[PDB]
Structure formats: C-alpha cells, structure tokens
Design a protein around this ligand. Structure first.
Ligand SMILES: CCCCCCCCCCCCCCCCCC(=O)OC[C@H](COP(=O)([O-])OCC(O)COP(=O)([O-])OC[C@@H](COC(=O)CCCCCCCCCCCCCCCCC)OC(=O)CCCCCCCCCCCCCCCCC)OC(=O)CCCCCCCCCCCCCCCCC
Ligand SMILES: CCCCCCCCCCCCCCCCCC(=O)OC[C@H](COP(=O)([O-])OCC(O)COP(=O)([O-])OC[C@@H](COC(=O)CCCCCCCCCCCCCCCCC)OC(=O)CCCCCCCCCCCCCCCCC)OC(=O)CCCCCCCCCCCCCCCCC
Ligand SMILES: CCCCCCCCCCCCCCCCCC(=O)OC[C@H](COP(=O)([O-])OCC[N+](C)(C)C)OC(=O)CCCCCCCCCCCCCCCCC
Lengths: 384, 482, 327, 54, 65, 65, 192
C-alpha cells in the first residue's frame, strides 16, 4: 500500500478480494477447484510494504498449485476481475464502517502520522477512489510496481532445492529483467506528529498515542518488541484494566517498516472521564521510560519467546517470516530470535522508550467528549 | 524416495488422484512414539520432535462433569481454578512466578468426559514443567477461603458462557440430547448451585476422581524421551491407585433423547440453530468413517468459500457450500463431531439471519441423508485430500500432545498418521452410503434453535416435517421454499 | 455411476487404441480463440488442397453475391459492413451478454453511434418506404474502408475472448425457461455436446488442435506463396492484388484509384528484418508516421470542457431577504 | 443450559399439566422400533384410503 | 438540488437485485437474494402466516413421538 | 457476533413498507411507496419495456399532429 | 475553549473559529451585528472570495444568548490548502480588531439598516421580533433600531472585536487534511 498513489489507492484490496481470478491460463472456477480438490489452502495478504500469496498442498499436487499461485500473483488483472473487485471493495468498506473495526481507526492514525502520502495511505484504500479501480489502473500499478527484482519465491518441505528451482524456472523465467530500466522506487518517508479529534456521540472514547520508534535495520527492534510484550502481557492488564473499571480495552501497537516505525498505546474506555484515561495511558507509557524491573523483564521475555516460537513451529508461518527476513536482510534471522531476546536488557528498553518519547506525539481521539481534552502542547508537556 | 522428483505425478494413476487403497508418500512415515504404563496406572506417552523449538506436556484426567451430581454440580469449575491457587510446597505467589517464568501458555480445558491441562514451554525446561505439572495437580491444598473467593469467579464464568454462542448452543444440544442423564447438564454447572460448593466437596471430588488409572501424560516437541519418561515417573509415582470400592456417579450409558428445544429471544438479530444425530463412541467400528463424514461436510464462512470466491455456487465440489452460498445471510456453518466413551454427537451448527431459519433447520440433514443414497466421487476425493492435509497439518506441540493424550485415554494407543490415512482412504462411495444409512438415514434428531423464533414457532414441535427431514430427496420440501 | 471407468470407456479408451484419457496440468475451458480458429480454418479451406482450388474458382460468384451485395445494401442504407458485422443487429437490439460486456467495458458512444446511424435511415424508411440514402450520407458511409472494420472486429472478438469467454465454465443444465410446457420442461443440456464428452476433467490434455505449422502458415501471404524480393514474384502479387481490388471496391482503396505497392513494400521491409535504402527517405518517414498513428490509441486532451451544474433551490423555496435582530 | 441473560423462572404458572414427562414410554433405546411402528400404522391408514381411491 | 431527495425530503429508496443477473463482473447474484426484501408477500409465501407474536425468555421442549 | 451481518460480511437489506399500514402513530404510508423498489416487475408493469438505452446531451422535438 | 478536528476525507475543508461575545443585555450586541454586516457584505467577499479561488465560501457567525454569546468566522475551501484557508481567515477577523474605515463602516451600517427594515416591514416578522424584544428587554426596542445602528462608531466595533479575540478560541475543522493544522497554542498565538 505504500507504493500506491491517490489514483490507484486500494488496488491491493481489490487484488486480495479477487486473488483467485485469472484468465490467461486457468479460470477462476478452475483455480478455485484446484485448491478445493487438492485438500490444501491458498491465501493472500498485504501490508503497507508487502504482498504475500501462500498455498500449502500435497507434494503430488505441488506443480499445479505453484502454477496457480504464480498466475494469480503475476498475471495482469482483467476487466471482469476489476469489476468484481470494485463490488467487493464497496462491500468491505461498508462492513468496516458498520463494525467500527480497529483497522478503520488505525487508518486515521497512519494518516495523521505520515499524511495522505506514503505510509499514511489506508490499507483498505481511499473510499472515494473505489469506482476508479478499473483494469487499467490495476495494470498500471502492477507495471510500475511488480518487477522481477521485487519478487521472492519460497518453498518449505522440498526434498531438493534444484527441483523447486526448475519448477520456478519454468514459470517466472520469462519475465524480462528490469535492471537498467527506470524503476518506480520509493520516496523516503516523513513523520509528522499531528492530532485528530473526532466527535461521534459515542458512549465510549478510543484514544491512541504513537511515536516514531525505529526501522527494521536498527538493533532496537527486539527491544521494542519486548517492550510491547511487557505492556500487553503484564503492565497494561495489571495497572490499567484491572484497577480501573472504565478501561474497556488497552493494547500496545508496534509497527516497524524499512525506514520508519510507530510504537504506542491504544486505549478505549468510558466516554466521560476521557481525561483520566488519557493521563493514565501517558503515565503507563512513561513508566517503561522510568525503568523496568528484572522480574517484569524476564516475564515479558518468556511470553515473547512463547509467542514467537509458537509462530515458528508451524511451517507456513515460519516460511513466511523466512521470506520476510530474506527480503529485509539477505540473511535469515528467525533461527536465532531467542538469542536476541535474551540479549535484551532492561536498561536498553528503558533508554529506547525514553528516546522515543521525545519525538513528536501522534495523538488520535474519537468519542463523545474528545473536545474536552488537553491540547497538543499539554500532551507534549505531560510526556516531557 | 519413490523417485528422483518429489513432485512427480506417476502414482496418481486414477484420473489425477490416488487409487482407493494408496496414500500419499508423506503420510507413509510416522514419528517415533513410546507409550508406557506405571504401577499407579498413570500412562506416559512421548512423541519427540527434535527439530521443533517447543515442548508441550498435556495431562488428561478422565475425571469430568460426568462424575458430578446435582448437589455437587460445578465442582470441576472450582477444581480447575483452585489447583493453581496454591499447593503444599508452593504458595500462590510462588506458583504464579513459576508459571510466568516458563510462559503463560497454560490451557485448562474442563470437558464433560475428561479434563485436559496443556503446558507449552521451551525444550530446556520441559522436565521442569512436568515437575510443576505433577505437583500442582497432586498436592494442591483447597482452603475454604480460596473456594469462597473463587465462587464469584465461577459464577461470573457461568453467566458469561453465553458470550461464546457456538459453545452455549453445543451445551444446549447436549442438554436436549441427554435429558435422562447427568451428561446433559452444562459443563459450567448449575448457577444456583455454584455458591453451594465447599472445600470438602472439592476435596472429595479430587480424591475419588483423580486416581492413577485416570492420568495420561503426553509429551511432544523437542523432548528427550528417556529423561522425560524418568522425570514423569518420578513426579507421578505418588498418585493414589484407583480403588474399586469408591462410587463414581453416572456410570451408565447416556441414551440419546431426541428433542427440539427453542430458546426464543427476539432481540438478537441472528439465529443459532443446531441439528445433531447420535454418533459413534471413540471405540465404535464406524469412528474414522464418521470423521470422514465430518470432513465431507467441512465448515463454511460468509467471507470465504462459495460465499466470496466463485462466479456461481454451482461451480464447486462441496454440496453444502453450494446451498450456503445460495443463501446470502446464512453466515456461519460448522460440522461438529464430538465422540465420547459411551455415546457421541455428530451434527451441524448454523448461525445466520432468522429469515432463513427453515433453510438452516432442514439443510444439514438433507445433505447427510442424501449421502445414504448417492455421493459423488468428487466429494469423496475432496474429503480424502482435506483429511490428508489436516493429518499433515498437526505441527504445534500443544495440539499434538493433547491429541496423543486423548487418543491414549480413549484407546490406550497412539493412532499414527499412516494408519488413519489408510483407514479413511479405503472408504468408497458404497461404503459411504452404507455408513450413512446406518447412522443418518431415517434417524432421530436433536434440534436446538436459539434466537428470534417468530417464523419457527409454527413448526417448533417434533412433527412430520422434522420426522421426514432425515430422509433424503423426500423431505426437502421445506428447505427449498424460501 | 462414473462416466469414466464405464464399460465403453474401459473397452475403447485404452492404450492399445491410443484412446486413453491423458491427465495434464489444469487449463481453462474454451482454450481456443474463435478468431484464430476461423483464421486458420479459412486459410486451410481457401489456400490449400482441392477445397482451396474449388473455392478459388468461386471467388467471382462469392464476391458478387456475398460481399458487393451486402455493401450495396449498406450503402443504400447509409451504412457500412461494420454496422452489420462489428456488432450484429441481434446483439445491438437484445443480447444480455453483449449488454453486460458493453456496459462494463465500452464507452457509450461506441454503440450510440451504431444505433443513431440506423436511426437516421429508419426514421424515414418507416415513415415512407423505399428510402434511398442521399449522396452526402452515402459519401461518409463510403469513406471508411474495410481495412479498419476488420481491425475493429478482430479487436472486439479478441477482447471478448480474452476477458469473458476465457473466464466461463459451462455446466450441465436443465431448461432455462421456467415454463410448465412438458416439452420445455424436460430439455437436457450437456449431452450431445462434443465438448462435454471429449474431456471429462479440467486436467485432461487437449486431443484435437491446430499444429504450429498450420498456425504459422496461416499468417503468411493470404494471396499466395510469392517472393516479393524477385521481380517475377512481385508481378504476380501485383496482378492478384489488382484483381482483388477490382472484385472488392471499398476493401482497401476507393473504387476509382489504384493501390500504392511501393508503400506496401516499404511497410513489409520495415516490419521484417530485411532493410535497404531503395526507398526515398520521405517515403520511409511517411510510412513510419502512418504506422505509429495507426497503432496509437486516442486519448482525451482535457480541453474545451462544458460547464458543470450546481443547482440551488429557487427563491420561493428559500427564506425572504429581511433579517432583523432576533431579540 | 439457558442463556446467561435469562433470570429466575417467573412466578407465572405456564404449565398446568406435566404431560412432557408423563407422556413417555421409557424406550430411549430401541426408538427406531417405535418409529417403525408409527410408520406401519400410517401405512395401514393410507392403504385403506388408497383402496377407496382405487 | 441535484441530490436524490431534491434537498427537501429523505426518500426510502432501494435498488432491487431482481431483474439483474450479475452483481459484479461476470459473477452471478445469490440465488435467494430477493428474500432479503423483508415484509413482502412476493418475497415468500411464509409471510402469509402474519400472526402477532413477540416473546423473550421463553424456552419450549418438544419430544419425539 | 450480535451484528446484523454477523460481524464478517455486509448484507444488502431493506425493510419493505409492503404489509405495513402506518409509517408511525396513526398515519398511513404513501400509496405509491412500493414503487420505490427499483428494478422489480412487481413494482410496475412498465419494467417489461427495458431495452438498453443511454443518452446524454440529446434533445428531440415533436410537433402536435 | 475546546477544539475538534474530524478527518472526513472530504474534497473540501470546513473550518470554524469562534469566541465568546456579549449577551443580549450588553449594549455591544448592535456593534457585533455591525461587525457581522462588515464581513458578510463588504469585507469577507473582497478579501477572501474575490482574491482567492480556493475559498469555496466564507461567512461570519454571530449568535446572542440570554447569558452568553458567540462571534466568529466559518470558512470552507480546498482541502489541499487548508492551512492557507485558516491563516488568512484569522487575519480578516484580526483586521477588524485593527480598525474600520469610515466608508466601510457607513456601507456596513447602511446594509444592516436595509436588512433590518426589510424584515420589519413585513408584519409577521415585526410581530415575532416584538415578542422577542418584550421577553428579553421587557420593552419594545425595534422601534429605534435605526438610531442604535447610527450611534455605532468604528472605535466601539474595533474595541469589542479586540476584547472578543482575547477569549479562549473554539476551533472546529472537518476535512481531508485537517490532521495538519497549527496547534491550538499556535492558533492562540496567531490570534494574539
Ligand atoms: C372452458 C370451460 C371449462 C373450464 C374448465 C376449467 C378447469 C376445471 C378443472 C380445475 C378447476 C379449478 C381451477 C383452479 C385454478 C387455479 C390455478 C389458476 O387459476 O392459475 C392461473 C392459471 C395459470 O397458472 P400459471 O401459474 O400462470 O401457469 C401457466 C403459466 O402461464 C406458464 O405458462 P407456460 O407457457 O409455461 O405453460 C403452457 C401451458 C402448458 O400446459 C400443458 O401443456 C398442460 C395441459 C393443461 C393442463 C391440463 C389439466 C388437466 C386436468 C384434468 C381434469 C379432469 C376433470 C376432473 C377435474 C376435477 C379434479 C380431478 O401451461 C398451462 O396452461 C398450465 C396452466 C393450467 C391451467 C389449469 C389449472 C386448473 C387445473 C389443474 C388440475 C386440477 C385442479 C383441481 C383443483 C380443485 C379440486 C378439484 O390460468 C388458468 O387457470 C387458465 C384457465 C384457462 C381456462 C380455459 C379452459 C382450459 C381448462 C383447463 C385445461 C383443460 C385442457 C384439456 C383437458 C383434457 C383432459 C382429458
Ligand atoms: C429403443 C428406445 C426408443 C425410445 C424412444 C423415446 C422417445 C422419446 C424421445 C427420446 C429422445 C429422441 C432422440 C433425440 C435426439 C436429439 C439429437 C440432438 O440433440 O440433436 C443433434 C443435432 C445437432 O447436432 P450438433 O450439431 O452436434 O449439435 C449438438 C448440440 O451442441 C447439443 O445441444 P444440447 O446439448 O444443448 O442438446 C439439447 C437437446 C437436444 O436438442 C434438441 O432439442 C433436440 C430436438 C429433437 C427434435 C426431434 C426429435 C425426434 C426423435 C426421434 C428419435 C427416433 C425414434 C424412433 C422410434 C422407433 C420405434 C420405437 O437435448 C435434449 O433435449 C436431449 C434429450 C434426450 C434424452 C434421451 C436420449 C435418448 C435415449 C434413448 C434410450 C432410452 C432407453 C430407455 C430408458 C428408460 C429409462 C431408464 O440436432 C438435430 O439436427 C436434430 C436431430 C434429430 C434426429 C432425430 C432422429 C433421426 C434418425 C431417425 C432414424 C429412424 C428411427 C426409426 C423410425 C421408424 C422405423 C420404423
Ligand atoms: C418389456 C420387457 C422389458 C424387460 C423386462 C424388465 C423388467 C425389470 C424392470 C426393471 C426396472 C424397474 C425398476 C426395479 C428395480 C429398481 C431398483 C432401484 O431403483 O434401486 C435403487 C433405489 C434407490 O432409491 P432410494 O434413493 O430411495 O434408496 C435409498 C435408500 N437407502 C438410503 C436406505 C439406501 O432403491 C434401492 O436402493 C433398491 C435396491 C433394490 C434393487 C431392486 C432391483 C429389482 C430388479 C429389477 C429387475 C431385474 C431384472 C430382471 C427383470 C426381468 C426381465 C426378464
């Protein structure tokens, strides 16, 4: 979604809603039947900076499933697929607005953090541009973005690497090399600490406070993950939800990108006394900057290890994170996450969070009494 | 290796599919698994996986809600929480610290026929977990004050059980299916009796039910078989052996009681319907066949499957998904197969807009009964492949350990992947028809409908329409209309 | 019962007779483009074999009674062959597939002009019969040659195949009409279709198709196997092209002029690897410019735009002018 | 097993008769035999009617 | 005004999926989409059973004959 | 979930005013309210004449005979 | 003195900046009306709408209440230049605090007289304002509105607007890029 412009915003959502629709070699019906009768699964997902298609099946069906996956991922979108995607995107937007899902709020948070350009571009796409997601816009987006140097292919459960290399050669070798040709490239991201305050006559008020933390290339990503685990598993529940009855739900959000990041809190509680919720969230966030105790750090590290290793145990998730690690760093770093987690110390986490606090806050508020909240300068002073 | 290429299609000698008897090469291999029995009767099973990054230990105790009475209903709920509260060796703070250090991934599932305690930790401390797990379940001390404190929590859990609509409907079908047996009572217990539990009741329950013969300890993941077995023996060698003189309530067969319950509530916007048949126990000959039927029905969602990705619902190989896609508002559908020692329930749970009430009411049976007369080979092979993939998809240590423990408890044996694949793959259209007519054709039903019932009040009684629903092409009159 | 493994299939579809079913990678139904199929079939029927010899002798009669007849009628109506061939009147009037494809893909004018051209004639013919279109309309009808109508036809058919006909999976079906008549009631669709029984699976390999040799041969010179490099070949090619132009008046040139063969040879040389400076630089520049323009899709300039309306409520639906201090 | 949002039973006496328990032949086992008996009775009735129709 | 309601009133408007074949692209509309039009006898014959009945907290038990 | 669409899909729903007499209180619904259901033959017999026809910037003039 | 900043993804951004004016009891109310007549008729059109094209529309709001009051501006323009819509608008209001020219004051007073007397000429509106005058001031004052408007002077209007500006601003913004606007403290500093 980071690579989309206002003209083609939401193209990734349309592709996801119509990821099985291909026409060149196999039909939507046939490529659905292949997944159905193979007993496996086929899925697509997309982040601000990534789009991953994954299919798991039996060995004997490997060739057909791989051909289907390649056709779905790399084939240009068709007009019929464009129309179906437009319809499904309208339905998805209506559902998201009706349910008031947390993603709809994160979209506003990102827009505030980075503006309408770049990272701030909503994952679901601009609602006013849905009608413009025709085959022409999708094909232009793919041509300007999908290039052979930006494609990665992954397999797991393969007896011999050469066999899968030959299988991929038979399919993706045609794509002419884009090296030496004008590439779209990505403009460097800029962080802005704006604020948003939405009046909605809602019985409950939802606030979010995020700060520019660090990118993937930095060595503090493990520290921020440990801090988020400490907040969610131990501190947020004990000090915020259990003690106060007007806290409906608090959770720490932590996103890392190739060049930027966002770490912070999102807390929803009673509409009235929103000032108390805001002050308590600020105090809890500042507590880590104050320091972290040994027992708390050990508990957070244990929880983080449990979660990460549970993810890594399943083959599909392990393969996905292997691809992501390879595309971020040429080496594979998911085989030694335990070592990095152990290396983390309370002082490092405290210093990282304290440094992040000094940044320009990104403050988003929705609810009935968002107006009666401290000004942006007041929030900065409280964090200070 | 069969040949040089792993992805070869030579063995697919039946129009792109394996023949009836053959199975995929991947399922021809089984991980090592050793099962042993101790003097106390505690059965230890280990299925090591060196490459895995985690170790899971699951303790299954055949004690469950089945062993409760009206005057002691809900004692299992107190038992599950109180076990963590304290022990003779360790205080509440000490056990809480120990649990936190090795991760909070402790899952306690209080079932009806048994209770499971699954703990997943790192490979280097798995033994420690056993030392903990054996102690917490063995030397727990149940104080009166702790029970008084936990009464409120248990009551709140019983009241909040309604949050999981599918779970509450499963409890309702259990209640309606077994009315002349305590097995029908809800797992969370009777609300008004929750405040009547005392420390002595819990102590008697644990003493008379947590016996050596009821304990099965299963281990999976990166676990050393010898070390784990020795440590588990040392930990669980002090469990008292089962005593025949003791009386275990509700030891007779819970005979199936066909019924139709209607929890009419016209302020829910949605309807939860469940239609179930009496199903084989864990030891019946037609066990894996009914699991194959479960795979045949599968599950459906409104944001996936035919509801989201197809030109028309007709273009697929799942018969039920066609119907579900044809219905815009029938949202959730899942086939539940719950087998127990004495009996079992196999059925379908739909959740969707009440305007399609009858459509959800008469659909599940119509498909199943239809398999008694004719099932297409496409569905047979779809279910075959799905079962193969699910067999190969059991990777998480906790899930595999729990499955091993349950299989040992209900069969005293670990059924390998290869054996299950050979069993299910041998099924044929004729065998499928014969099993379906044995279990589904012209058979009684247990039906529950929870939610707005304004449309369904007219036929809310067990009548000719419900009677003929379990037939095949005869009885689809009501489903198609609307 | 399974259609495959039936006794007939077991006895006949066996390796001994080479009638066995072969399973390959999955592929879409309707794997063959109709336009390409008809191109290859036409080439085989006309330019090869005894059928080709017979059909070549019938070129005069076919041109007189199948091309100039349609052209004469269309010109009488102020129309061209495009109006009757690009979109058949059947599709233009009542066809839901065409309607949906046009709505989802086509700009309104592409069919609005087609409808209005016929409206011109039929507003007069129905009022008073025997209408002969005057010369001024006939002139604009005659201006467009068949060389552009063929391009439009091929573009439309290829688009329809690649986008819609390539994304369809037919199924066994009962009567579409929900008519109580027993004759319509028990209509069975799916049997008696060659495609239904040719392949029982979507993985089956295709057993009947055109060889690559035939496909490549059908893309050669339609008039015949000549050698435009040698003078002897060029003479025969020019003779055949001249007689063709005589037979078809508005196919490639106006019925009173002559075809420019030097420009055609320059185009052929530029298109293929053969090259030389035997042509004037002006000719090469003109040919390149014409080729670029012919393959250029028109685009909107965003200029000379009309004014958009922002309607407001009338005065009588709005409050009066006066407004005093309320209190 | 009622929903949590349900409270205690209302004092209103909805049932005057307990036919739900009284109207029982305790044959939860062997239910299919009773179903066959009911089908046979229906068959006899339908056979008489069909004889008149014939 | 150019708005649908002309700027004076709100119109309870609906575009019935009847008389349509495809909801999007070449995809077909749901077979029973028309049933989503509540309160219409044309949608279903079951609407002819239009007795007044509303109830909460009511549980009914019926046993197999 | 307790949502109209079950929390994972969007439902194109509409409560037809057919079979209802009163908008609210004691006033009848407009007689031709049912016509606001576009694209339904039941709404009107004028939908049988439904051939494709779209035009912008088109003016025609007719004179009294 | 709260603030509201709603992200609506509207192609146009609507801003509103208001301050506490005087109640009906205070005699400055007439002056405030003149100030409104100084904006909705003469200034706000020339300074904002005529010079700048992205200003869709600007207007001056003036509400009076028995115990409080509100006075300020509401503007609407292109979202992409939301900041430019804000700053300039403030300046216009601030310009009133700077001073009023004699010709502009005379034009505004003439326009206000025309509007008020057009309202009063109709019997129904005259009766309504008579009722409101009786219920507010306990007497009838619409008979001498012209004299009150005449008595207004530029100095009084300037002083009243300057005093009003010192109050805590109330700021509302709905648009596609309202997330990037000067902070409330910056707004106050600019107003200062
Ligand atoms: C004139 C003087 C005599 C009058 C006799 C009247 C009838 C007497 C008996 C019935 C009395 C009760 C009537 C209740 C009607 C309720 C339904 C209704 O009104 O709906 C509107 C109905 C149309 O329904 P629809 O849903 O729109 O379906 C048609 C669609 O347009 C779809 O169009 P499509 O193009 O898809 O289909 C084309 C065509 C294709 O059709 C065919 O090819 C089929 C052939 C025609 C039907 C044959 C029926 C044979 C009946 C034999 C009866 C023997 C005598 C004993 C009778 C007592 C009971 C046993 O379809 C039809 O025509 C089907 C419509 C059938 C109309 C007749 C319905 C009534 C008879 C039904 C059976 C008995 C019901 C008894 C109920 C009460 C209890 C006693 O319109 C009519 O009823 C039209 C009436 C025309 C009257 C003119 C005379 C014709 C009389 C009937 C046909 C006789 C044929 C010769 C028989 C020879 C035997 C040896
Ligand atoms: C021994 C047993 C006798 C039983 C008699 C039963 C009588 C009831 C009728 C049964 C059906 C009759 C045959 C129908 C053939 C239809 C062919 C067809 O589809 O058209 C292909 C053809 C076009 O082919 P194409 O270009 O490849 O296009 C293919 C489409 O894509 C394909 O398009 P599509 O896939 O959309 O097709 C749509 C439509 C096809 O399109 C149509 O709408 C067809 C319209 C046909 C109208 C004319 C019908 C005349 C039928 C006469 C048949 C001979 C009777 C001889 C009786 C002798 C005494 C017993 O499909 C249908 O409606 C076909 C349904 C038929 C199902 C039954 C098949 C035959 C079963 C026979 C064995 C039964 C055993 C008992 C079972 C009991 C229960 C277990 O259409 C035509 O031009 C029509 C041809 C009609 C030929 C009629 C027969 C000529 C030869 C007669 C020889 C002499 C006979 C003896 C004379 C007396 C001597 C003393
Ligand atoms: C004019 C001369 C003609 C030659 C003479 C031919 C006479 C024979 C006529 C045969 C056709 C009539 C049908 C009878 C059998 C149909 C069985 C059926 O439908 O089964 C499937 C149907 C399926 O319907 P279903 O779906 O309702 O059944 C489902 C029920 N559960 C779920 C419990 C399985 O029913 C059966 O399964 C019944 C199986 C029994 C099979 C009975 C066969 C009888 C033999 C018939 C004739 C044999 C040849 C000899 C004839 C003598 C000639 C010389």
């Amino acid at each position: 979604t980071r690579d989309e412009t206002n003209e083609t915003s939401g193209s990734l959502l349309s592709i996801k809603n119509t990821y099985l629709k291909t026409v060149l070699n196999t039909n939507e019906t046939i490529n659905y039947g292949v997944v159905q009768q193979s007993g496996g699964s086929f899925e697509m997902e997309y982040d601000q900076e990534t789009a991953y298609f994954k299919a798991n099946c039996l060995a004997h069906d490997a060739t057909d499933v791989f051909s289907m996956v390649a056709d779905c991922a790399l084939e240009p979108r068709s007009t019929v697929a464009a129309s179906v995607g437009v319809e499904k995107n309208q339905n998805t937007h209506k559902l998201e607005s009706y349910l008031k899902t947390g993603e709809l709020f994160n979209e506003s948070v990102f827009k505030t953090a980075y503006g309408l350009k770049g990272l701030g571009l909503p994952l679901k796409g601009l609602r006013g541009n849905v009608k413009n997601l025709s085959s022409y816009t999708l094909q232009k987006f793919q041509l300007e973005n999908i290039t052979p140097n930006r494609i990665f292919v992954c397999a797991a459960g393969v007896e011999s690497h050469q066999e899968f290399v030959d299988l991929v050669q038979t399919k993706l070798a045609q794509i002419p090399s884009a090296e030496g040709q004008k590439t779209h490239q990505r403009e460097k991201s800029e962080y802005l600490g704006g604020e948003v305050r939405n009046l909605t006559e809602e019985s409950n008020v939802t606030l979010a406070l995020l700060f520019q933390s660090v990118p993937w290339s930095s060595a503090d990503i493990v520290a921020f993950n440990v801090a988020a685990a400490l907040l969610n598993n131990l501190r947020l529940k004990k000090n915020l939800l259990q003690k106060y009855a007007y806290f409906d739900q608090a959770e720490a959000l932590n996103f890392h990108f190739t060049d930027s990041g966002l770490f912070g809190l999102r807390t929803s509680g009673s509409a009235d006394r929103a000032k108390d919720i805001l002050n308590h969230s600020i105090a809890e966030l500042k507590a880590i900057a104050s320091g972290v105790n040994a027992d708390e750090l050990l508990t957070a590290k244990a929880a983080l290890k449990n979660s990460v290793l549970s993810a890594l145990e399943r083959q599909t998730d392990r393969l996905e994170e292997t691809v992501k690690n390879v595309r971020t760093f040429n080496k594979i770093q998911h085989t030694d996450y335990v070592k990095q987690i152990d290396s983390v110390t309370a002082d490092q986490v405290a210093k990282a969070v304290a440094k992040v606090l000094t940044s320009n806050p990104t403050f988003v508020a929705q609810g009935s009494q968002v107006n009666a909240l401290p000004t942006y300068d007041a929030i900065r002073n409280l964090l200070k | 290796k069969s040949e040089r290429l792993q992805f070869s299609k030579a063995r697919l000698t039946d129009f792109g599919e394996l023949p009836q008897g053959e199975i995929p090469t991947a399922l021809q291999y089984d991980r090592p698994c050793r099962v042993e029995t101790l003097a106390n009767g505690v059965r230890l099973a280990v299925e090591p996986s060196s490459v895995s990054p985690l170790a899971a230990v699951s303790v299954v105790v055949r004690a469950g809600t089945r062993q409760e009475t009206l005057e002691t209903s809900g004692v299992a709920q107190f038992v599950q929480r109180l076990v963590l509260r304290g022990t003779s060796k360790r205080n509440r703070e000490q056990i809480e610290k120990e649990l936190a250090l090795l991760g909070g991934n402790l899952k306690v599932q209080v079932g009806r026929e048994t209770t499971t305690y699954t703990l997943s930790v790192l490979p280097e401390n798995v033994e420690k977990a056993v030392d903990f797990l054996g102690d917490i379940l063995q030397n727990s001390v149940f104080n009166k004050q702790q029970v008084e404190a936990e009464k409120e929590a248990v009551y709140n859990n019983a009241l909040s059980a309604q949050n999981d609509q599918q779970g509450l409907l499963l409890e309702n079908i259990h209640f309606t299916a077994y009315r002349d047996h305590y097995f029908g009572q809800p797992t969370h217990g009777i609300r008004e009796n929750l405040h009547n539990i005392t420390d002595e009741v819990v102590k008697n329950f644990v003493k008379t039910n947590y016996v050596g013969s009821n304990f099965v300890v299963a281990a999976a993941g990166n676990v050393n078989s010898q070390a784990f077995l020795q440590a588990a023996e040392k930990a669980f060698g002090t469990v008292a052996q089962k005593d025949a003189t003791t009386f275990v309530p509700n030891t007779e067969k819970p005979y199936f009681t066909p019924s139709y319950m209607t929890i009419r509530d016209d302020e829910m916007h949605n309807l939860n319907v469940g239609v179930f048949f009496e199903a084989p126990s864990w030891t019946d000959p037609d066990f894996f066949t009914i699991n194959f039927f479960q795979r045949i029905l599968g599950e459906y969602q409104a944001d996936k499957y035919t509801g989201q990705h197809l030109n028309t619902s007709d273009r697929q190989y799942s018969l039920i998904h066609k119907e579900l896609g044809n219905l815009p508002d029938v949202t959730i559908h899942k086939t539940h197969y719950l087998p127990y020692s004495d009996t079992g329930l196999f059925g379908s749970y739909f959740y969707g807009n009440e305007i399609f009430g009858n459509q959800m009411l008469f659909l599940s049976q119509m498909i199943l009964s239809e398999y008694a007369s004719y099932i297409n080979q496409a569905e047979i092979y779809r279910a075959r492949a799905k079962y193969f993939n699910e067999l190969l998809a059991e990777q998480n240590s906790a899930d595999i350990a729990s499955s091993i423990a349950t299989q040992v408890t209900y069969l005293n044996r670990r059924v390998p992947r290869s054996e299950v694949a050979k069993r299910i793959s041998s099924l044929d259209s004729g065998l499928i028809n014969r099993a379906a007519t044995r279990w589904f054709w012209d058979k009684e039903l247990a039906i529950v409908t929870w939610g707005p019932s304004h449309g369904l009040i007219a036929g809310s009684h067990y009548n000719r329409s419900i009677k003929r629903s379990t037939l095949g092409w005869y009885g689809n009159t009501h489903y198609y209309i609307v | 019962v399974r259609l495959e493994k039936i006794l007939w299939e077991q006895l006949v579809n066996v390796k001994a007779f080479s009638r066995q079913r072969v399973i390959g990678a999955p592929s879409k139904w309707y794997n063959e483009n109709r336009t390409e199929w008809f191109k290859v079939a036409q080439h085989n029927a006309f330019n090869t074999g005894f059928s080709g010899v017979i059909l070549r002798a019938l070129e005069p009669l076919l041109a007189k009674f199948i091309y100039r007849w349609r052209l004469d009628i269309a010109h009488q109506r102020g129309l061209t062959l495009e109006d009757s061939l690009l979109f058949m009147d059947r599709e233009l009037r009542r066809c839901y597939f065409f309607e949906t494809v046009a709505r989802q893909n086509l700009h309104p004018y592409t069919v609005l002009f087609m409808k209005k051209r016929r409206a011109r004639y039929y507003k007069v013919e129905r009022g008073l019969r025997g209408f002969y279109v005057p010369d001024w309309v006939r002139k604009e009808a005659e201006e467009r040659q068949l060389s552009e109508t063929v391009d439009n036809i091929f573009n439309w058919e290829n688009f329809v195949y690649r986008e819609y006909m390539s994304d369809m999976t037919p199924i066994g079906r009962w009567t579409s009409l929900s008519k109580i008549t027993p004759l319509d009631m028990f209509q069975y669709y799916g049997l008696f279709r060659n495609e239904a029984w040719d392949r029982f699976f979507y993985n089956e390999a295709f057993y009947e198709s055109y060889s690559e040799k035939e496909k490549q041969e059908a893309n050669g010179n339609p008039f015949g196997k000549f050698n435009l490099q040698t003078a002897d070949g060029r003479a025969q090619f020019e003779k055949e092209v001249n007689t063709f132009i005589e037979r078809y008046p508005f196919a490639v040139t106006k019925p009173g002029q002559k075809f420019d063969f030097t420009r055609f040879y320059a185009l052929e040389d530029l298109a293929n690897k053969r090259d030389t400076s035997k042509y004037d630089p002006a000719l090469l520049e003109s040919v390149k410019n014409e080729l670029k323009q012919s393959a250029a899709l028109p685009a909107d300039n965003g200029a000379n735009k009309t004014k958009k309306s922002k309607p407001i409520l009338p005065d009588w639906l709005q409050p009066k002018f006066g407004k005093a201090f309320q209190a | 097993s009622r929903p949590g949002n349900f409270g205690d039973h209302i004092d209103f006496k909805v049932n005057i008769d307990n036919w739900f328990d009284e109207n029982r032949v305790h044959n939860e086992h062997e239910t299919d035999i009773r179903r066959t008996q009911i089908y046979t009775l229906n068959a006899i009735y339908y056979g008489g009617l069909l004889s008149f129709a014939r | 005004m150019n708005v649908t309601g002309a700027g004076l009133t709100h119109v309870k408007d609906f575009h019935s999926d009847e008389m349509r074949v495809f909801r999007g692209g070449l995809r077909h509309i749901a077979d029973k989409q028309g049933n989503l039009i509540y309160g219409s006898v044309n949608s279903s014959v079951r609407y002819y059973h239009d007795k007044m009945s509303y109830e909460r907290g009511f549980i009914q038990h019926s046993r197999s004959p």
